[PDB]
Subunit: 333 residues, 4 copies
Amino acid sequence: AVKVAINGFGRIGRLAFRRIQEVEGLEVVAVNDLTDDDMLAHLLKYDTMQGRFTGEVEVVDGGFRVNGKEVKSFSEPDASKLPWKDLNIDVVLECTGFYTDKDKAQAHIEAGAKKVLISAPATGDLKTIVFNTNHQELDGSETVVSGASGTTNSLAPVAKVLNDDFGLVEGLMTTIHAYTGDQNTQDAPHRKGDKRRARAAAENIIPNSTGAAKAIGKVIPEIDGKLDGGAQRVPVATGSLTELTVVLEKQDVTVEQVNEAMKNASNESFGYTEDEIVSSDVVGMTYGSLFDATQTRVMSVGDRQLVKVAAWYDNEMSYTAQLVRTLAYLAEL
Amino acid sequence: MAVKVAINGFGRIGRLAFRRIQEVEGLEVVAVNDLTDDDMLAHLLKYDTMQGRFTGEVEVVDGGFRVNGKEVKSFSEPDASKLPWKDLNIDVVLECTGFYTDKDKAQAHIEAGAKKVLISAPATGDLKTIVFNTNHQELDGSETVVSGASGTTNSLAPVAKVLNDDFGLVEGLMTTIHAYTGDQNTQDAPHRKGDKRRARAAAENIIPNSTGAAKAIGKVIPEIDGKLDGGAQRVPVATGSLTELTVVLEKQDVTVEQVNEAMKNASNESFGYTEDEIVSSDVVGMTYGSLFDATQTRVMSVGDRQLVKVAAWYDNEMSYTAQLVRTLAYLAEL
Amino acid sequence: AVKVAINGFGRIGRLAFRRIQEVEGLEVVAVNDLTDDDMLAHLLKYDTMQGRFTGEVEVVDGGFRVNGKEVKSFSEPDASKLPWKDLNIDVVLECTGFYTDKDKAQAHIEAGAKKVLISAPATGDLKTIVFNTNHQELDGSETVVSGASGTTNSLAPVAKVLNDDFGLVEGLMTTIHAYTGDQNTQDAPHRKGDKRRARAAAENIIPNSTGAAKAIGKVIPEIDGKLDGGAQRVPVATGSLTELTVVLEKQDVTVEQVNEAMKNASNESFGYTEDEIVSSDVVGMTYGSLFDATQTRVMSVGDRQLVKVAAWYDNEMSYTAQLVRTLAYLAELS
Amino acid sequence: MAVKVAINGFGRIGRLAFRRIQEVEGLEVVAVNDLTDDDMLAHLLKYDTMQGRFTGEVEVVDGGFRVNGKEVKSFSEPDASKLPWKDLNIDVVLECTGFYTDKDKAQAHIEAGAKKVLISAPATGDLKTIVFNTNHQELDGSETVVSGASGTTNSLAPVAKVLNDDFGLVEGLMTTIHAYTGDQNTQDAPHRKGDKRRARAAAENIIPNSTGAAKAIGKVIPEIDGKLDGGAQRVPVATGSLTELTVVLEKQDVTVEQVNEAMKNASNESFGYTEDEIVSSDVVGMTYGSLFDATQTRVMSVGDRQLVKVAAWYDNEMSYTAQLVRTLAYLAEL
Ligand SMILES: NC(=O)c1ccc[n+]([C@@H]2O[C@H](COP(=O)([O-])OP(=O)(O)OC[C@H]3O[C@@H](n4cnc5c(N)ncnc54)[C@H](O)[C@@H]3O)[C@@H](O)[C@H]2O)c1
Ligand SMILES: NC(=O)c1ccc[n+]([C@@H]2O[C@H](COP(=O)([O-])OP(=O)(O)OC[C@H]3O[C@@H](n4cnc5c(N)ncnc54)[C@H](O)[C@@H]3O)[C@@H](O)[C@H]2O)c1
Ligand SMILES: NC(=O)c1ccc[n+]([C@@H]2O[C@H](COP(=O)([O-])OP(=O)(O)OC[C@H]3O[C@@H](n4cnc5c(N)ncnc54)[C@H](O)[C@@H]3O)[C@@H](O)[C@H]2O)c1
Ligand SMILES: NC(=O)c1ccc[n+]([C@@H]2O[C@H](COP(=O)([O-])OP(=O)(O)OC[C@H]3O[C@@H](n4cnc5c(N)ncnc54)[C@H](O)[C@@H]3O)[C@@H](O)[C@H]2O)c1
């Protein structure tokens, strides 16, 4: 089995862990964060939105035991000092939010790990992977890799069908997105100086930025520079929706043509629905993106068309299933 | 004389219209009709989850309730044709029930004795749909039934009118990220209109939904009739909403600054302008019918081809109410 | 298998349906509500707090097919007119909220059902059953029976231990309780005239009544009249917490004594925990009441003690699991 | 002439203290210290999710910010002993960081040059704990570090005092149903104090928690030292809270009206009284330190033995802050 360390046992780290339980050839041997074992153990076991952890968890000496298997824990905020050589780590899942750079992430490798898969977009000379859109670009020699963002994962397979079947001229996106842990509970100073992320997360529609559309060319180079957009953080604790408005090259585009094109591209990563669902219906789903055929619109004025589509994602679990697929694929090369 | 106003449907809109009318000299609410007792009516005027405590004093009396010493008569008659509007001398009925959104239906208030009816919603039939400071000048004061449009329409109109006038609107799509409203369920249950999405827990979901605001925009700005469409996402804020508009324009080298400057130049009491990074709670209770947020303007350019995106905030409650009351005053005054 | 009809395919009826899928012995053959098949099928399948329904649901002619089994559906608001004789109904789960009286429920019997188990407290000459506290009072000759309430099911086994081991003098209760469907999404008239249920459910701590404590004597007659209290509806969509403050006869009571007595009474209905959980952790649980040992307090001033305890319940699934146990038990007698 | 105030920690309480000080003669905020830039400080004064837009005008300038023409200097120094309080002539520091709640730590502001420190929380050490209008008369103005207690203490004290003075308090237990605060997480995450319950999603849970309000009440009302205890349930409102107290009393034939009348007779600027069926959003921004709700009073009687329960609302933000600023004014004036 591939030996995994999880750095940052936060929302993604912990759900990556739950997910790795359902995956042969992957084993989490170690976990690092900034808290005690009791806390780590407790947060794995109970999850507001994702539900009770099905197995058994107990705090032991080196960390905690999950279903008889011992997971070692650490409390070391500087990664370069983790005992990854001593532990024989194949891959570190980098989930802290603080090592989102090819150069910053290289500290795990100095610590003894063989690879680092970052749970976020990341700066620097590395590949950005959405599984089932461009994971074939990995040859397994890579040491640092980005699993992109929940939003990119929602967007990529939608954008790829649109461009392959119709020719993407240009488009704009808004993600209506669950609030995340980088937002305040109450209006308070925000450490990045962001006046909107400063505000009470569960009491507001909050406009915010996201590089998902700007940087999409890292995943689909042929549409590099053709999309942009941002987010509206809103009071659901998880569950998100990506809206994409586009101009296409193809001329007499109908709703049915778009939907059929989308359905034909469905797989484990890209789902397709025609049910009138809402966000809580995607909590815990493992599709990276779920195309909502009910939300497709075609605006036509003479020969000129604007096409709009929308895809659901559990920004938590959807992203986490994608990340773990990329992990397994990366491990296997 | 002050204009004698009846409010039919003392709901979110009715009650906020009432609070609003207290600050608009020249208008007086003499009567209120709903489906409940005075105690309930008085109580909900005084206390408001999102809009705050009512500033004056409210007390339940015989015919209804007393607000700062002025008596408001109240009724509990679901059939409007049977209200005593002649006897009370009603000049204008604010029609805020959600149940008379048709020119012929709201005609029942006129059969009841009122002189005019201003419907607090889009409305079907042969009547004018008015967004104050965009097309209120189409009123000549002979009208007897008028629609004040919707919150979202009021958010959208002055934005669309600037875009078309300064740049030529080719076409556009809209999403409103919208506070939940009383037409949604508290918990997943049957919905009376059979709407499977409004059926779901309002405060626990991002819920897709329809709105005619972009489709019917041609009622307010006829030169762009047919050029916009879009919908809503109802999300868990109890009030406050945001309209996002994505457009194709005829003018060619459009910049963020051109759009923002064009919007700023059209600002007035109905259409506001901000460059502060605000969020939805910051517009709760504001009186602009639409607040253009210059921090959300994007221009997407690929060769000669551009997509332009803008967004305007609105308190679907208070913004809409301020605009409806301005229309009321203007209508009354003719 | 026992042939079950569900009257009222609401939160409780739908979850009862999901639950019945996990019980050999029982089959839902029919469902009655006020809406179309499409709506029913949709709400079974999708659930905001309780998650997707695991099986497959498809709308067919008579109603819907769940995992190949056909469920007939009706849209008949008057129960006496349902085809219960024709369908051979053994037990009606009465989940509408509108038939909470022995004689009202009696309409299902006139319709051809053999028994009626009401999903709520219920007035009249019948038994009120909390499973594993007093379900042994059933001999199976009963035709109408009440499953009591979420809150009563959370309370009874706590109160029974307290009285049996320590002697209950008196006590007061507050249930801190998820908002339910009879509360309003936005501040509006409430049909029962309740000025607190009238307010926006998801934006307030809201005081409300509950008969759970007053009426506990229907479940545990030896403590009849010794308890009282109410609720505070707060903005969680499901999950609730009952706090009980009591005076006991026994004199030198410790936290450990209370906890150990609770632990010793645990079973499939009454759970016990020492983990620092919160309400989202009990969503979907099947204990009717989960005693939280971390919240036990003993206040002592000289010889005089106040003792406080607290038990969690998913007012939806805890209540439903209890209701389904009572149904199974009732069905199995004669 | 005005008393010169510095606000250490410009958070929920620090900012709302600032707004509140605008309405008080002879207090002036000349300085503000936090851990962020001027832009962030200015912005958060101006916009407030639950308390509404700040009425005056706020602009970022060199030393900090201008509020209605008055310059406020700002600093970003996490170690208080290094702030220029001597240079600025600080009379009183409002200690609102949450990080200096001990007399000896707090003494760092005095080392910095301030004359006095009023801490915006319970505080450890040899100092006075003041709830205004309950025990502020224990101040003689020689004190240099003082605690303004907690939101919950301020809600409780005047209720407890009336109970003891008029009836004789034997003992009691409290639960505060309390809005979530900023030491709670947005999403389930490690919590810095190891609190497994404060670690959970604030706005998605009923969350049991501790509070010393009842335990430490003796610091404010010595004659009832040791006679109360209790805790909290943090729930998903953003502000607004409710204290429930269940007591045993020496007086024997106590009625609901007796208790209520006693409470009414003790009302003042700090202690309000209502008989309206309000809810938590009705107390947002109120300036009563506690608002006694006569509608929630219960008396449980079994033979000669009674349990009495009462309930007081408080805006844990503004109610506390109004009380804090009164104590500040009083302290300044001696
Ligand atoms: N919907 C989503 O939450 C989502 C989706 C996709 C990607 N992500 C990304 O995943 C990463 C984690 O986000 P999250 O929501 O799980 O955040 P989180 O706050 O829940 O988890 C971060 C964890 O990192 C720990 N941490 C911080 N600094 C550390 C350090 N130096 N060493 C060890 N641990 C440290 C924290 O204690 C915390 O438990 C972020 O980069 C985020 O962008 C989040
Ligand atoms: N965001 C908004 O709430 C918003 C904004 C703009 C416009 N509107 C429109 O205004 C109308 C009402 O809006 P609301 O949100 O205040 O709804 P609401 O339910 O709160 O108010 C409707 C009121 O009408 C009463 N009522 C219903 N039928 C009646 C009858 N036959 N006779 C007398 N009273 C009756 C109801 O009891 C209720 O008080 C709807 O048309 C709505 O679309 C709503
Ligand atoms: N936490 C809870 O939701 C809770 C807990 C325990 C018990 N209960 C009790 O169970 C009952 C149902 O509560 P719910 O919360 O599931 O309510 P709900 O509104 O979600 O369900 C009631 C359903 O009955 C239908 N209905 C109303 N009248 C009808 C009629 N005459 N014929 C057929 N269908 C009719 C409605 O369409 C609705 O689907 C109530 O008696 C309630 O007190 C609720
Ligand atoms: N309901 C309430 O919010 C409430 C009620 C009563 C008392 N209090 C008390 O008031 C205090 C602050 O509470 P709050 O809710 O306003 O929290 P907050 O987080 O909103 O405010 C604290 C502020 O102090 C700043 N800060 C932190 N450390 C600092 C440092 N060492 N130097 C300078 N600035 C620093 C933070 O950036 C933050 O802006 C706490 O002691 C709390 O218990 C809060």
